[PDB]
A paper describes a structure:
The structure of GP-ΔM in complex with [name]-His revealed that each trimeric GP-ΔM molecule is bound by three [name] molecules. Each [name] binds to relatively conserved quaternary epitopes on GP, including HR1, the fusion loop, the N-terminus of GP2, and the β1/β2 strands of [name], forming a large buried interface of 966 Å2. All three complementarity-determining regions (CDRs) of [name] strongly interact with an N-linked glycan on Asn563 (N563 glycan) of HR1, which is critical for GP2’s stability and membrane fusion function, burying 316 Å2 at the interface. [name] stabilizes the glycan through strong hydrophobic interactions and hydrogen bonding, pulling the glycan closer to itself. This results in a significant positional shift of the N563 glycan, a phenomenon observed for the first time. First, [name] stabilizes the N563 glycan and the N-terminus of GP2 while bridging two GP2 subunits and connecting [name] and GP2, thereby enhancing the stability of the pre-fusion GP.
The GP protein of [name] guides viral entry into human cells and is a primary target for neutralizing antibodies. [name] contains a receptor-binding site (RBS) that is concealed by a glycan cap and a mucin-like domain (MLD). GP2 features a fusion peptide and two heptad repeat regions (HR1 and HR2).
Author numbering:
A (entry chain E), E (entry chain F), F (entry chain D): 1 to 123
B (entry chain C), C (entry chain B), D (entry chain A): 32 to 199, 212 to 225, 503 to 613
The structure:
């Protein structure tokens, strides 16, 4: 259950900033954890960021640690991914995932997936 | 579909056996092992009133058992003797191959009555109960256990520095209770940087004539202890990986019909061999990743 | 020496690991599957008086058990509760891992008194008794079974539709009786042109923490169903192949000393690997089917 | 680390699986055999008063068993029925799958009372007790056994021989007692220059619907016979090899947690395959035995 | 078991007809099923035709269906294989086999075998 | 337990004679069996000769049978290996091993080892 809908993708220059969104349906949003996955062209899906059901433990991948910040708003059933100091190797398809109270790295433990959005950064 | 991790220069990277594992040398079956990490290293409460809330009774699901080879020292272990109000037992007697969990610091023995609404007692959070190199999904009567999870991984090819003798005896106390009305990134509440492990060592334990079972150590003298604290990223990575691999393992156990499973790593090795040299692999093609001269 | 059939383009051909299978792409052990087909699909009589005549008692032969992974819906199933004239039981109690055959449309319960010459009850025609993914050569007391035979297959490479969920509801009726004085061409009386199968879950069957055994389906909510009526030659060839392979399986079970055998397909894979890449072969040599370009 | 011998031109060479099997052709698992040889062929005293002193009682060591596929005719076999002074049994009842030794000439039935310190009876010299293709480390109550050791072996390619049928009558007498107060070089005091073996028929056993368990032979009519008196060095070498390889087997058994072990040779084959086609082997090198032309 | 003896082989032209025979010893011929196997040069033994212990069901291979007919005569303990519209790829050694009850395709299930006869057809 | 100490190695001409020694510590020498192992350059360790805890049975390798004799002196806690008619392929490092009452060929069954001595024979 729980449908997801990402938005905010586009084309940005190198060193710029971008912010994504992911709105979830249903009324049990506060019981779910959200994570962001990105898939580089010709590469497999990989973990980017995450958050709990209460926003007290956020985990980041080593590649994006310190540049990306993730937050959630339980009153709007949305999560955000603020991107700063973008680099040419960050171009990928960013996907939104949902799973029950917790936080996980492997992609096969997640229940609901979004279709993803395209983020392309130009040198 | 059970994930397995590959260790390289004290760095853990999870990757299934399919994913082009040829730059990662797999020469013998001695490189495949499973580790029984316990939950108390993740920051969960361990006192009896809060640990009891994680176990419930369920009728209609048969129990399963999984073998694991290496373990960890446990600060808290439990031993249940629950009875029904009319005097009937609630927990099944332990099978012959099941023995108490070794290397426990404290053993909380719980006794008393309570309402038992099912055939077996399961873990509400999905974890396992560990009994001396045999993880099980149910609680057996009168045997010491420590709740934890088990992970599979591929060791580097070396002199077996991992799980050796003290790289850098014991006393367990009595605490009795009476109750009524009974790159992977770590993302747990807490992770314990130090790994104080115990394991059994095939061969290399016979001097004089000690290999004879008659003139041999008892069931508690087999184990070889150690300690690993130099790196802490690898340890928390292993703990997080052990938490993640539980779902695929529980479903695999549900599918199978064998009472005790000892042949997961052998199946992984056969799968690897069948994937890689399965047939007509090409020299130039990257699928048959070999080298010319 | 157990025959196995390979499937390509919905056609069945019988071969073995020793015969060169090079176009026959065996890449993973997921392609190795064993299916147990019911004996009533060949046109045999299924009513109790005729079915009773096919079972007899013998003493001096230990029973053996082998597994199968996929089955077939059974129109008639049996459940025996017979006993000796003096009141002693004739049939042994079922072991712990044995459960009744799932997906039975009718269950004939037979109970009464009759002579019991031997220790166990065998099949006079050499067939097996199917007990929930565990084929046995003897009848157990009070457990539902269905007569059938077991065949071994090599599924086509990574197609994923064979034994899937409804490629192209369960109600059981109990009928009670009382008794006293108890390449391949199809060549059977009749062959059923439809195969309504059931198989164990394809591992992943959990979404909302349904993988936890506590919050999980019971022992009867695991199986996945389907239907394969499209092809007629393939499934009747499968039935005939399952008819033929019984002699070799029975002799192999006689030779072995295991109580339950789970490792036939693994041994077949090991034989295939040790045969085709045995060692010291040649680039132009046909023993190892390797394509230089 | 269990040693295993390779036969070539009636010569025995001991070499582990990890190397020195390049020129040694392994093509199928049919070439892997395990043989159990009796101690009485080594010249040990065999009468009851002397054989009794070789068995002692210990408490605190769990028992383990191994299976062996070929055996040897035994001149003397034993059958114990010891009891405690109060009347309690000393020896555990045999499990379901354990049966007496197949081929014996004399069976010494020993029955009486004596002290029984431990829980199980072990061999003071490290040897095993052989029960019908199942070598145990403890004595079971009322089952005929012959004490001996087990060796693991690799056979010539096929040769349709070497444990064939009679290459070149059964009658056992009972003697009842009553007691109270109960290239390698041969180096034993004696080695028997004849090996009069027995082994289970290799799968293909019977015709004329004698493969049906209902009409098949009993549990003691499935063996074949043979004789290998032609060669003297090879079989004394085999006896010495078994005597040497008892230490590693016992250590491996103590390490493991399986009640019954059947998968040593399969693990050896998997290890061989992983060693020699592990990955990226050179076209011209000792590691990778594939050679051009 | 029973003893088998084939006869009737020889050299025939393409499109011609040929008939084989197989006489069995013993007095329990009506309890046995008889089948014909052929082995092409450089090929393995394969199933050709068969019959039950009472006639009724007869099975044929796909390659020979419609051209070969098999029959038995319990009064003479013989079986026949009528061969019509012969083709160049029918050159093989035809073997006679027998087994108790039912026709079977695999060759390892048969109890008694004959020495076989040579049938060759010239283009 | 038990320490071993070889001596007597050196350089000898072809066809000459050489005698080695191996003194063992402790006071339970009569309960131990002693054997000699040699390791040719670029090869593995192999069995050469042995003796029991009371003499009696002695075993020799096929290569050195008839040329080497082994003896022990329980009153001196030493064993000897008399070498006669030496050949150029006898160049190796000769090692002394001790083990509980018995006699064995495989090197993994021995408990105490010595450091070994060098024997070189010149053509
Ligand atoms: C794979 O698929 C195969 C093909 O589908 C299966 O093969 C079947 O194997 C069965 C077991 O071998 C086999 O059944 C046998 O039939 C033999 C035929 O003899 C009888 O033929 C009919 C049968 O009718 C019987 O009559 C009974 C009394 O009315 C009824 O209870 C019932 O209808 C019986 O089936 C009939 O004309 C005669 O009774 C005949 O028996 C006499 O005459 C025949 C003449 O040939 C002679 O052979 C007999 O000896 C009699 O004089 C039968 O012989 C077999 O055994 C019976 O007799 C023996 C001998 O005394 C005795 O020991 C048995 O206990 C028994 O009484 C046996 O019943 C069946 O025919 C095969 N199927 C076909 C269609 O060919 C495989 O089983 C399958 N594999 C697996 C593993 O499932
Ligand atoms: C593979 O093959 C190997 C070779 O064939 C086998 O080796 C055997 O190993 C066993 C176990 O280690 C050894 O057994 C015993 O060895 C000591 C021998 O001393 C004893 O026997 C001497 C002769 O008298 C005996 O005669 C017969 C037997 O011939 C016997 O029935 C009598 O009862 C009597 O004892 C004699 O020796 C004394 O003199 C020696 C010098 O000559 C001196 O070194 C020794 O110390 C003695 O003073 C004594 O009579 C003596 O009793 C024996 O002491 C050992 O027993 C002690 O230790 C045991 C283990 O700790 C313990 O159980 C026992 O109670 C004692 O405390 C030991 O049992 C065999 O000798 C040896 N065989 C050979 C030929 O050397 C392997 O077992 C095989 N492997 C397998 C089967 O897997
Ligand atoms: C891998 O690692 C992750 C992360 O550490 C582990 O995730 C944990 O999973 C378990 C089980 O899924 C989670 O437990 C659940 O928690 C939710 C949330 O409840 C919270 O808020 C409640 C208020 O509404 C509050 O009551 C809860 O407090 C409980 O615990 C405190 C002590 O901590 C105790 O004082 C209270 O009395 C409560 O008992 C809590 O703060 C909760 O709603 C869930 O309950 C549902 O399910 C249970 C049965 O499972 C049952 O009561 C009902 O069905 C109920 O609706 C449940 O308790 C836990 O929160 C996760 N931890 C984190 C930090 O995310 C994961 O388990 C690891 N894997 C393995 C295999 O161990
Ligand atoms: O009831 C479940 C649990 O879910 C909420 O998200 C938490 O904040 C707790 O207050 C409660």
């Amino acid at each position: 259950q729980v449908q997801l809908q990402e938005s905010g993708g586009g084309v940005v220059q190198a060193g710029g900033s971008l912010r994504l969104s992911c709105s979830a349906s249903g009324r049990t949003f506060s019981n779910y954890a959200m994570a962001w996955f990105r898939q580089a062209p010709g590469k497999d899906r990989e973990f980017a960021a995450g958050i709990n059901y209460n926003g007290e433990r956020t985990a980041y991948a080593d590649s994006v640690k310190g540049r990306f910040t993730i937050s959630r708003d339980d009153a709007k059933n949305t999560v955000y991914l603020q991107m700063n100091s973008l680099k040419p190797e960050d171009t990928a398809v960013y996907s939104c995932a949902a799973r029950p109270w917790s936080i996980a790295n492997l992609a096969y433990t997640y229940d609901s997936w979004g279709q993803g959005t395209q983020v392309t950064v130009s040198s | 579909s059970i994930p397995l991790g590959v260790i390289h220069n004290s760095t853990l990277q999870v990757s299934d056996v399919d994913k082009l594992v040829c730059r990662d040398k797999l020469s013998s079956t001695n490189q495949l092992r499973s580790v029984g990490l316990n939950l108390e290293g993740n920051g969960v409460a361990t006192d009896v009133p809060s640990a009891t809330k994680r176990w419930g009774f369920r009728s209609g699901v048969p129990p399963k058992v999984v073998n694991y080879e290496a373990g960890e020292w446990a600060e808290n272990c439990y031993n249940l003797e629950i009875k029904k109000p009319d005097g009937s037992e609630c927990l099944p007697a332990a099978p012959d191959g099941i023995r108490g969990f070794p290397r426990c610091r404290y053993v909380h023995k719980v006794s008393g009555t309570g309402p038992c609404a099912g055939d077996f007692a399961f873990h509400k959070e999905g974890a396992f109960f560990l009994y001396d190199r045999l993880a099980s999904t149910v609680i057996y009567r009168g045997t010491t256990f420590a709740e934890g999870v088990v992970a599979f991984l591929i060791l580097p090819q070396a002199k077996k520095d991992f799980f050796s003798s003290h790289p850098l005896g014991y006393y367990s106390t009595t605490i009795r209770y009476q109750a009524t009305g009974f790159a992977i990134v770590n993302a747990q509440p807490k992770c314990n940087p130090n790994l104080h492990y115990w394991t059994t060592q095939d061969e290399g334990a016979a001097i004089g004539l000690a290999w004879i079972p008659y003139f041999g150590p008892a069931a508690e003298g087999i184990y070889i202890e150690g300690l690993m604290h130099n790196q802490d990223g690898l340890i928390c990575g292993l703990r997080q990986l052990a938490n993640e691999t539980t779902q695929a393992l529980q479903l695999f156990l549900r599918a199978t019909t064998e009472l005790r499973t000892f042949s997961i790593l052998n199946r992984k090795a056969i799968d690897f061999l069948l994937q890689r040299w399965g047939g007509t692999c090409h020299i130039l093609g990257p699928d048959c990743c070999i080298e010319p001269h």
